C-alpha cells in the first residue's frame, strides 16, 4: 500500500510566487518518494499546481481529486477535456489525474480523509497556503486525530510565515488548556516540502503522551 497525502491548499495562486513554487516543490518531493496525492480537484491555483506536477512526474494513477456534484462542468472547454458516461465534464485525466464526483461536501471530506487514513506509512495531511475552507479542512482532520478516529500526522507547509498566526494560536490554546497536553503536537509545521513529507513519515500519535507520562507512568 503506497503512502497517500491529502494536500489542503488555495484555489487561488497567492500573491507571492513562493506559494506556487512551494506547490511545485511539494509535488516534486511527493512524486520522488512515490507518494500518491489526494486533493480538492481544482485545476487552478496551488491545488491545480500540485496535481499538475505530481501527475506530470508519475501519471494519472498517481493523483486523485474529489469534486462535489455542484462544482461539475457540463461543457468541455479548456483544461476540462475528460467526459464521464453521465456526460459530466471533468479535469483532463492525463494532466490532472483521476477524479471522483460525489454528491455533497460531507462525503467528499469523508472520502479524502478515508483515502489518507487507509494509506501506507508516511500517509498524512498537508495544509499548504489557503483560505477559510482549507482551514476548516485542516482543523477537521485535527479534530479527528484528537477524537482517536485516525492516527495520521498533520503538517502545515509554512511559506513565508503564512501559518505563523495559527501556530501562535495553537501555542496560546495549549497554554490555556483548551488543547489538552499531548494534543499540541497533532499539527506540526515545516519550512519546506521535504520537511513536511519527512514530518508526516516521522509522526507518532502516542509520542507526546509518552514523553508526558512515561517518567511518571
**Residues of the shown chain interacting with a copy of itself in the complex, contacts defined by CB under 8 A:** 10, 12, 14-16, 19, 106, 129-136, 139-140, 142-143, 146, 161-173, 175-180, 183, 186
* Complex with a copy of itself: residue 92 or 139, whichever CB lies closer: 139
Question: Within 13 A of 4's CA, how many CA atoms are on the CB side?
Answer: 19
Beta bridge partners of 68: 102
Name the minimum Å distance from CB 4 to a copy of itself.
Answer: 22
* Complex with a copy of itself: residue 57 or 166, whichever CB lies closer: 166
The owner of cell 461539475 is 72
Name the minimum Å distance from CB 200 to a copy of itself.
Answer: 18
**Which 8-state DSSP code applies to residue 22?**
H
Name the minimum Å distance from CB 212 to a copy of itself.
Answer: 16
**Cα distance between residue 17 and residue 103, in whole Å:** 34
Name the minimum Å distance from CB 9 to a copy of itself.
Answer: 9
Parallel, antiparallel, or unpaired for β 36-39 and 4-8? Answer: parallel
* Complex with a copy of itself: residue 143 or 206, whichever CB lies closer: 143
How far from the centroid of its chain's Cα atoms is residue 107's Cα?
A: 16
Name the minimum Å distance from CB 175 to a copy of itself.
Answer: 7
* Complex with a copy of itself: residue 95 or 111, whichever CB lies closer: 111
* Complex with a copy of itself: residue 143 or 151, whichever CB lies closer: 143
Best CA proximity match to 113, nearest among 187, 4, 212 = 4
- Which parts of the chain fold into alpha helices (H)? 17-32, 45-58, 93-96, 105-117, 132-146, 164-176, 193-202, 207-213
Amino acid at each position: 500500500p503506497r503512502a497517500k497525502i491529502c494536500v489542503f491548499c488555495g484555489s487561488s495562486g497567492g500573491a507571492s510566487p513562493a506559494h506556487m513554487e512551494a506547490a511545485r516543490q511539494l509535488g516534486r518531493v511527493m512524486a520522488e518518494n512515490n507518494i500518491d496525492l489526494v486533493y480538492g480537484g481544482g485545476t487552478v491555483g496551488l491545488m491545480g499546481e500540485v496535481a499538475r506536477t505530481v501527475c506530470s512526474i508519475n501519471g494519472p494513477e498517481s493523483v486523485h481529486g474529489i469534486i462535489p456534484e455542484a462544482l461539475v462542468r457540463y461543457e468541455r472547454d479548456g483544461t476540462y477535456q475528460t467526459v464521464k458516461d453521465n456526460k459530466q465534464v471533468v479535469p483532463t485525466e492525463t494532466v490532472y489525474g483521476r477524479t471522483t464526483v460525489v454528491k455533497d461536501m460531507h462525503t467528499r471530506k469523508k472520502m479524502m480523509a478515508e483515502e489518507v487514513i487507509s494509506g501506507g506509512p508516511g500517509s498524512g495531511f498537508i495544509g499548504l497556503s489557503g483560505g477559510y475552507g482549507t482551514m476548516e479542512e485542516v482543523f477537521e482532520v485535527i479534530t479527528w486525530n484528537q477524537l482517536g478516529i485516525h492516527t495520521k500526522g498533520i503538517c502545515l507547509l509554512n511559506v513565508e510565515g503564512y501559518w505563523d498566526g495559527i501556530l501562535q494560536w495553537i501555542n496560546m490554546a495549549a497554554a490555556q488548556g483548551f488543547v489538552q497536553p499531548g494534543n499540541e503536537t497533532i499539527v506540526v509545521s515545516a519550512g519546506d516540502a521535504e520537511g513536511a513529507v519527512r514530518a508526516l513519515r516521522e509522526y507518532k500519535v502516542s509520542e507526546a503522551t509518552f514523553k508526558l507520562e512515561w517518567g511518571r507512568q
